[model samples]
Target: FACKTANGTAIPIGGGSANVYVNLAPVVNVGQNLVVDLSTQIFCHNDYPETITDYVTLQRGSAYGGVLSNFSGTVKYSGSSYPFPTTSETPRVVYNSRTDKPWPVALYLTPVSSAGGVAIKAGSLIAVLILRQTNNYNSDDFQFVWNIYANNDVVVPT
Candidate 1:
């Protein structure tokens, strides 16, 4: 899903295999990946807090008995191409099925300075979900949650 959030708002998308998540927007195909728009909507205007809480989170779905031990993410820049700047925290996965929460979410971490080096873009994605098939897994199960919150936007720092 090539999605985005603006000014300090967010939305979720999931359908088909990505069922029971939220209104499918920017399009989604659970078998593929997800996109997050963390743009400032203003060129060269970095819009991220220094603390950057919750940066990204995923409420993992049923792992199908560890068969679906595959899920990752990457920073999105240059429109749709991932690993755009060749620098970002890579999303990692972990399977831990609890009573109600089955699969565990994955996360990656990477950030840089302001002023264009690795600052926020006006109308582009800051990150995305990348669930791959590098391991063995079932085809009938694999789902999770997507989110970004008051975690984005800037206080306008240098």
Candidate 2:
């Protein structure tokens, strides 16, 4: 299910899953070594001055409960595919909500080949949350900051 603010702005709610295809190239089967190639984006409520005035870090978490490895990527706003130079994690900024606000990311995970790996399970949940730190406050407290849709049609052989 999806939710929106009073103004109808889409809010990042939770409990969603993506069906990641396991039979594709760079794919892994049960008990085999595997890696995850991922791309994520976050859009903040641009009109909210509280969000843009301060700096925040958009972190990745999963309902998979497995350790993620080789996590590296560039952070940027607008268009598609890291078009401009990359930014650091320390002060990764949010885009202007109305004019320019869409945070895109590229990340990876390893050991996804584990037979019972939750992270690789078809329909398992993947989340994009945030950690906001300002002079007087800090927060890692939001439901679904964003969501990902994994296409997992072909089931893995048992």
Candidate 3:
């Protein structure tokens, strides 16, 4: 099918596809900055794995082009001493460490690499909540929950 445009020209219809669900804050106008709050739970209980490097960090996943074409914050943990399996309500943090540009424009929850490349001790577990910037919008889908262990095994908890 074809439709008429302002120039009185016809253009062919195109095909499109979509994902099942998407998790984003809200629509923010252009040139605006966005701040996303990320909630997390860090625990260190007997039942939980035993490792000094056990911790979680929020990362932008492959769904958004891994680290090549996506934005991300430094890999930080909630801290050590979390009672295994014991849920610790750490204060929600923001991913926007930079203020030069729009923040959290399209942030999501993703597990960090298994290397635990970030500095986090073992016997601890960290889970980060979904964070997004309403100022900018991206067509990609974002995953929820990022589970980090001392072994560097990043899991998508949610």
Candidate 4:
């Protein structure tokens, strides 16, 4: 099917396709519990469906203290709760003490249903991340959370 454009020429309307980035927050400090009210965060008009691809850290100043002793999160969806570190091991990013550079954290979430990954629907999706300073630190070891960009997968309808 074709639609008339400003020039009155017939143009084919293909599947909706576009990309977007949602900034979760900037400088979410240490000892801070980050809570994202996904109800307000998700705003898809149905023209395009959104899914999380990964979480990207725009800067490298952020430091992970090389320990997961006090870091964890609780993800709730569809009336069920999925806890981080489902196993004994906690999810943590390895960092070089000499360099102080941390790796970007992935946005993948434990499956709430048979389907895996966190899918942002038309309603509420809340996640609480707890970060505690338990590792020994020096001046250069100062923990920080910088800008986090949510890589979203926008699905186009055909």
Off by over 4 Å in 2: 1-9, 12-41, 48-54, 59-90, 112-119, 131-144, 147-149, 153-158
Task: Write one digit per residue (lDDT tens) for candidate 2, span 1-158.
Answer: 22232223454423232232222222445444332333223333434455434343443433322222212223232223331122323344543344434333333332333333233334434323333323223342333343343434223343
Tens digits of per-residue lDDT for model 3 on 20-108? 12222232222222222222121111111232111122233222222112112332223322221223333322233221211111222
lDDT of each: 0.25, 0.33, 0.24, 0.26
Q: By summed lDDT, which 10 consecutive residues of candidate 3 come out lowest?
A: 39-48
Model 2 residue pairs with clashes: 18-150, 19-150, 19-151, 19-152, 20-152, 46-97
Report the lDDT of model 1 for residue 18.
21
Quick one: ranking by TM-score, best first? Answer: 2, 1, 4, 3
- Stretches off by above 4 angstroms in model 1 are 1-124, 132-152
Model 4 accuracy (lDDT, Cα)? 0.26
- Tens digits of lDDT, candidate 4, 11-72: 22231212223334322334344343332332111111132111111122121111122234
Off by over 4 Å in 3: 1-23, 40-53, 58-60, 63-158
Which ten contiguous residues of candidate 4 have the minimum total lDDT?
A: 58-67
Q: Point to the candidate with the largest TM-score.
A: 2
Better of 3 and 4 by TM-score: 4
lDDT string for model 1 (1-158, tens) is 11222332222222112211221123223333433333332111112223221112232222211111222344433223343323433343322221111122222222322221213222323322322211122232222222222122212222
Off by over 4 Å in 4: 1-20, 43-71, 85-148, 151-158
lDDT of 3 at 61: 23
